[PDB]
Amino acid sequence: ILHYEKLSKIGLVKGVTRKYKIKSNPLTKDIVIKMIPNVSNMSQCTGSVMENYKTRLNGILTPIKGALEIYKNNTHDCGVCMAGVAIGIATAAQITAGVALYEAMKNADNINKLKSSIESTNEAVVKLQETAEKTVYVFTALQDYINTNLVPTIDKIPCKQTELSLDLALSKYLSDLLFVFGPNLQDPVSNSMTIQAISQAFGGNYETLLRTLGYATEDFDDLLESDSITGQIIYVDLSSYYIIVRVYFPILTEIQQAYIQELLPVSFNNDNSEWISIVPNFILVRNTLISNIEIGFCLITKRSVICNQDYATPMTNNMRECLTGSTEKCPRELVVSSHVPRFALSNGVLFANCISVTCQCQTTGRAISQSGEQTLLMIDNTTCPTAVLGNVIISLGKYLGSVNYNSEGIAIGPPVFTDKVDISSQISSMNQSLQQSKDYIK
Amino acid sequence: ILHYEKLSKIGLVKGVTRKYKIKSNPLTKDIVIKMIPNVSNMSQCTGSVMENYKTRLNGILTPIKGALEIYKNNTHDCGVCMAGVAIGIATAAQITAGVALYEAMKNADNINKLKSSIESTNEAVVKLQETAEKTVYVFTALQDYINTNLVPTIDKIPCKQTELSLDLALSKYLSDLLFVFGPNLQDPVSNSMTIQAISQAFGGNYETLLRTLGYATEDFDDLLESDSITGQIIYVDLSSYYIIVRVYFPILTEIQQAYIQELLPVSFNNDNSEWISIVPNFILVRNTLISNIEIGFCLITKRSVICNQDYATPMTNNMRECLTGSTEKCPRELVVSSHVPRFALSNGVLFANCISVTCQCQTTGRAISQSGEQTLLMIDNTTCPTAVLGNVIISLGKYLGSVNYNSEGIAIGPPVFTDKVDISSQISSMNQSLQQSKDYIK
Amino acid sequence: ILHYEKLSKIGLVKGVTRKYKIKSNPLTKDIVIKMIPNVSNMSQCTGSVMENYKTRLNGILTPIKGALEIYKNNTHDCGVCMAGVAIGIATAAQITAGVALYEAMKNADNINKLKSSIESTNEAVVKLQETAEKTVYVFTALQDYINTNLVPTIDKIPCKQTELSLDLALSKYLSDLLFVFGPNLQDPVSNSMTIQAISQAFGGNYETLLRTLGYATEDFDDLLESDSITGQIIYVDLSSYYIIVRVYFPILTEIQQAYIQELLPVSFNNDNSEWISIVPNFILVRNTLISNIEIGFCLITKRSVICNQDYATPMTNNMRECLTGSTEKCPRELVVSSHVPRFALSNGVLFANCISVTCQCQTTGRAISQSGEQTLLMIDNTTCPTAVLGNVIISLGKYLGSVNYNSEGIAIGPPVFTDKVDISSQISSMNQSLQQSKDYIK
Amino acid sequence: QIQLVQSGPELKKPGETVKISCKASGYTFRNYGVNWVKQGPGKDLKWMGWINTLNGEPTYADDFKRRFAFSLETSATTAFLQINNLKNEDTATYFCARTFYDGYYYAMDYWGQGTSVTVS
Amino acid sequence: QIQLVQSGPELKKPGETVKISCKASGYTFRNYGVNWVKQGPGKDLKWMGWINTLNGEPTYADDFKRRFAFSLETSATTAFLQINNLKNEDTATYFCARTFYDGYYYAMDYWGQGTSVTVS
Amino acid sequence: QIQLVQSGPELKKPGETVKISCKASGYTFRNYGVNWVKQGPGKDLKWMGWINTLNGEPTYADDFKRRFAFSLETSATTAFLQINNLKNEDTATYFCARTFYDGYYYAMDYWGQGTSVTVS
Amino acid sequence: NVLTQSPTIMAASLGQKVTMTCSANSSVSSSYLHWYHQKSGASPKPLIHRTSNLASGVPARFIGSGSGTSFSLTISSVEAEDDATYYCQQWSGYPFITFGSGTKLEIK
Amino acid sequence: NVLTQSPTIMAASLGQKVTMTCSANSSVSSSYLHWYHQKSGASPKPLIHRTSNLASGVPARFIGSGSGTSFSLTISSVEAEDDATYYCQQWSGYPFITFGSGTKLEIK
Amino acid sequence: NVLTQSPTIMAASLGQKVTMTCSANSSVSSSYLHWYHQKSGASPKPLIHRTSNLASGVPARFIGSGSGTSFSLTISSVEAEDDATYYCQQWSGYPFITFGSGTKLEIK
Ligand SMILES: *[C@@H]1O[C@H](CO)[C@@H](O)[C@H](O)[C@H]1NC(C)=O
Ligand SMILES: *[C@@H]1O[C@H](CO)[C@@H](O)[C@H](O)[C@H]1NC(C)=O
């Protein structure tokens, strides 16, 4: 129930309308990542680098298993029975993630019977047959580099340089890996980690993983860019150095009776200076309720806004009154900079502040003048079919609304300042004034 | 017209003065980027990776062309005539960038006559002769990797492994494009994209692009780090998979009668505790007006500040009064941490809070004492030539100003709290007191 | 002296308690980084890329030496003396860093006598013997790539392609290097730069440097992830193109009589709607004082919090009274979103808002009901030994505290809004009301 | 210049075997593959398969899985085609083909002069 | 299949020199190393050293650093071990084994049949 | 050790041709280039050009673009210099040197003993 | 995916323009269609390498167009040497190769 | 790091289960211990490659276990062909290779 | 870039120090200047490889200095074997190579 006509005279021009949708209904798949390469065809001159690499990797892998073992012990089948006393401190998300983790024990146990086959792989991507009806994919960290560069050149270079190169490659891999799986991974139970972060164990090549898994969705790009694809770690092996990860593929669903409206701000002249209005730019309306939204956590597209959570935020009563047509209480700020917008186009109609910009009609060759009592001018083809603003020639449509738009004025609100130190100064001043008033009252 | 002497006793010590300058007057050049490599010398056992790569790339390239075609249709020569009815909704920035797109049409048409030569290139960097007086450069995405690694090794390993090597390289390249050219690129009409982001289509090697074009500016380093070099996409080809980009090279111009002043904060003692003053650190003065500036979007150097826009913002009246001498208007905050500065050096003169640090004159070997009614001490060579503060020996100059600096006091303002949560709490308390007073008034 | 029982009814559930520790007592080591590779075994057709690379690198290296020469001239032995008049403007940190820089002159001079040996190295990692008891390590930027790829392939392809590949590699290295050592490095005197940023001159492989230096600490990962390992540049050579860097290894020390407490927020129902309480989540208590802390700069672990600096900040008196048991002074906010927590577990005791979630006892097969006068329910095995919340079965312990928890209520505070535009609107409204009250007072 | 030369006409009675040859010159033999095309009576064109010149692995169409085989002689840059258990329907004309591929499209840029086989 | 064949028994007098053989077949010789093991009286087992088949660099144990030497003859894939100052103490049985390593563990999967040396 | 050996003195009549050789030994021939230097009467030194030992591509100075040509013999590690249409001004001493470059500076570390040519 | 050419035989006079047709059982991408021509006693040679792109050395009087399952070839002005047999061919990979039936051109 | 095996000789009856030992002068990681067996007039062959992992072709009736400095080998049911000599070996790198003393098994 | 050496001939006594000059028609970087010396009946050999850096095996009694377009060479104490001819050379790339005119030294 927004009043666009009154908001236009303040400097707020309506824009595009979009839909609201959230993810739901995920599916599940399982993959295996092997974190140690095979050096069988270059073993004669590798050296002692592999033992040091194992020693370094074991101390990184141990804490994750230690954290995971907590929920394994106290969860059992009764509809899953849990032991609250042993856990002690937990949240709802942790409990849900623990139930989800327990739900994958059968698949993990079925996969774990192929340890010998997993340990013997020597290719970047290998397909394994767990059962007659289901298959498992295995990915190796640095098999391609060894297979491509080191092995063919082994007979043209002394092995000291090859050992140095292998050590450098392993150190670079560890340096790239330490950012995600290091001490920062305090809570591995949850399933909020995106596939992009998980792909760092494979060199950041999540495209290969997604292509191999065989995605069959048309909203694939929107799901990927909205961080709606996640993963969870369900098993860690300290002897063979591999982990098992479960991937979730959700479905986007559209909320009914909801849309988001956009406003374009334009500066206006009141006394002898330029002013701008401080109001939210994006407004969420569902059913008949108006509320704020933090759109910075969501993907903005041409037709709809894709989110992964409900980001509704409450709004004060004064803002609601201002948005409904009570312009006498909408705050404004002074303009000091020179790089501000001064005109906008909406449905073939032009709104411009002609005090600080040239306005002349191309058809008649005569200038357009703005009085001191007007904030903005509406220009359509009923008066000037073709107008020029600097170096651009534009043709205009017809305005749908009041015919006396340029002869009616409005009311304005109080000025404000939006700087942090200014906020503190204003608070101090208002408190001192209130204290003096209270002293006089006493 | 700042009063440095009074601001010094509060803990604000003046620093370096810098100049203000902004960019202007760009020049234009055109380049061509080819997003598909040439595999003519290894075509026998490439498999089917190329068709899948083409299918993946076409769906990414299509939306950009679809968005660009909107301004292509409705712009024509009349000094360029547009159709505001067909466009519907647009901003001032979009309209301005639409005109620049039409001015590059002539150059793009001439380049497109070399379509056969563009797709036959087989080198990373190729120079083409568009006319007898003008030349065009073409860059290929992954030609270097194929020409150097894959081709020479083709006869030493079965190429069933080279197919996987080629497939992995292509997928890794695609993983980097999606951050810039993916759905995030909602509005390609504007020309605010930096050359660093554009270089992601060439593997992030923006140094090669600039060196080939032959930059001839001494301010090249400052322009690059301030994000003053931008680009615009003007043509997309869906059959040959290449794009045309125009680059802008601006010129830095100095604003006259403007400078920026810096202040150094030092803690001081008032009753029995340490306090700090909450004032802006950077102050912009032009002509005779004082205003704030968001220097976080600008590059700070030793001599001047380089900005791509004008970032001036208003300042409240009370803070303007405090900088001119009124010391009872600036608020202060309590110090609880132990890691705070306690002394500073300015023009060979030392300001220190000797209550919380050890002060003693090295020349006479006796300590320097601070009374309870003093906030800071000024130390020069008129009273102590050489002073020691811990493990450093310093020699001092002479102070230019009042000779009775240490015998004159000042006034102080009210305390404040600047925590995010404390802001909400302070607002609630003030309203309840205000409402209570109104009830008695009734 | 926090009152957990009263805070629980507001929706604040206590969590884990952690320790507080800061770094101290660093050690020192010196390394040498060489920024130019050796091309002796491929010099026949290198072209002219090396001269251009030298010309590009000299203009980047010069400003750092120019900035460093300032403190070299005015510092001399006398337990060190500085000319305060010549320096002019400086801070305490800069003076301390200058002292630290002066302390390394003897080591720098001792190292500098091996220039001929440094210039002749042709391996990625080389060990040099500075003295009979001390050794120095030298690292080369791009020696491994040349030694591995370019040299063996020199006889299979025309070497114009090798020239292009070498130029591309050098340009990519320069593009990666320009981010850290460019104009952004305004003050190289300080020693706050981390080793991760410094490693960019070696391709970001800090793991190799750390392994070669031989770290011998168990808190190595915690020190690395908390940004407690830093470096400083002490010498720049413009003729041989190498620098000398000093590395600091600190020791973590635990603060006595200090700990950090965590609170878990849960929504509650008051009239007909859901509410949440706005209070700090982390509270720092040392001795007997309560204060805030910005934990965003620290590292959070299971048992302790590691910070490289003291981040204590003051706290308002009203918040302190609220935390001690004065619930009528604690603000709250309305809930509009649907994704909020509604139950939590603490020491085997369950707190839940059963108005907006199902609550039935599994043992007796009966539902649990909440009246309109209650905000939350405490569930233990005294009434319901086993409870079910949706699809989870949980076993509960015994509550330690009052036996009449569910029969006594508390008071609530005023509602607030936490949006920036809402803050501005509230400030404007309060100022207008205060002005009207002052007018009536007059 | 690029040139492909085949053998001459041959006549055979049912039940024997036949071997065709194809000589290539003027270019790098290892860089391109070779296809075989059949033109029977009625001027219809059929495709049999191709042989990789790096490894020597052949590929056959569904209608030619049994009685046909390919081979290579890298030393003389010669490719061979052999047919076993000849019958009446094998009377046709065969052709050599050079595969060209650059990443955009496929083509058969040069062809042989053809060899005629008659079964009676 | 994988097979290693050694020379026959030899008898010597003190002061002379001896030369043994370790021929290998059935696998890529250059991809694996060769170890030498001594089994003296009392059935004790001792490790002497190993030789790299790519460069030819030998490596000796602490107790065998003076009178022993290793060599290769890569054309026929044969390894040799020479000893001087032959003494009754040197009377033992020598074996040559194959080294296996894949990144997880070391193993000596294949062994020779052994050669006996007698000093009198 | 590194050593360069040239041919002996020669005498020729105007209009004839001359060929001078330069032998190299003691180092890897393919890793370094060869320069030619002329020392005419008056002890002046002038630079003629250099030849790449990998590809064999020569490079000539501005004053020597017509009557001079370089050639290489990789098998014997020998470089040649040939002059056509001799005249009176060609009487001088020639030198075959070596090029050293490591990324910092250029140098001519080793020189030949020189060859004398007289035209009459 | 068989390809059917409607004109089995066609006669034209000098200077006249003619048009041939090429039907497809299934939907074929425009990047997988080619044209070939063959004279009597000679091997086939490429004529057009895409839906519209001419081959090297082909006169500009040949025009090719089409989309979906219907394609066509057009000659603006025939001459004496244009008496050959034309074939439409598809190729979307090594296993998927199919030739047309061919069309014979005669001169009056 | 010498390795000492306690039973120098041991006799067993068909079907009986037996257990041998393997001590260590110092701590040894579980990933560096192996077992070998040798018959009369033949070369040694691998039996167990880690603390518990069986080698290729070895019957499942052999069980290996141990930790720290004490390790053991167990046979669940002996047969007629189990009359060989067994040894424990430690290999933590090229220079550090050590063999045990060996244990002889007899059949009653 | 013509390089001119001022002393065409110089005589000195044992133990005396001497100085030679090397001028340049245009500015030359200090990293592109070298010095060579040649004795009678022998090929030239390097003496100094930069403005100041000595070559291998050269006695430390030779000192070189200069900047811009003026450069010089100094000998602290002459001996009997210093009767050679010296040349100043500039090398800033393959096409840009130039030699000086040379200076001959005599001993009284
Ligand atoms: C409050 O309003 C008065 C005008 O009535 C104005 O002078 C004053 O600056 C305002 N103060 C704040 C903090 O908004
Ligand atoms: C306002 O000032 C009073 C004393 O005048 C002080 O007690 C109170 O904390 C202050 N409140 C705020 C919000 O600044």
Numbering used by the authors:
A (entry chain G), B (entry chain A), C (entry chain D): 27 to 104, 112 to 475
D (entry chain H), E (entry chain B), F (entry chain C): 1 to 52, 52A, 53 to 82, 82A, 82B, 82C, 83 to 100, 100A, ...
G (entry chain L), H (entry chain E), I (entry chain F): 2 to 27, 27A, 28 to 95, 95A, 96 to 107
Sentences reproduced from the published study:
NiV has two membrane-anchored glycoproteins, the attachment protein (G, also known as RBP (receptor binding protein)) and fusion (F) protein, that mediate receptor binding and entry into host cells. NiV F initially exists as a homo-trimer on the viral surface, where it adopts a prefusion conformation. G/RBP binding to the cellular receptor, ephrin-B2 or -B3, triggers a conformational change in F that facilitates fusion of the viral and cellular membranes as F adopts the highly stable postfusion conformation. Here, we immunize mice with a rationally designed, prefusion-stabilized trimeric form of NiV F and identify ten antibodies that neutralize NiV in an in vitro infection assay.
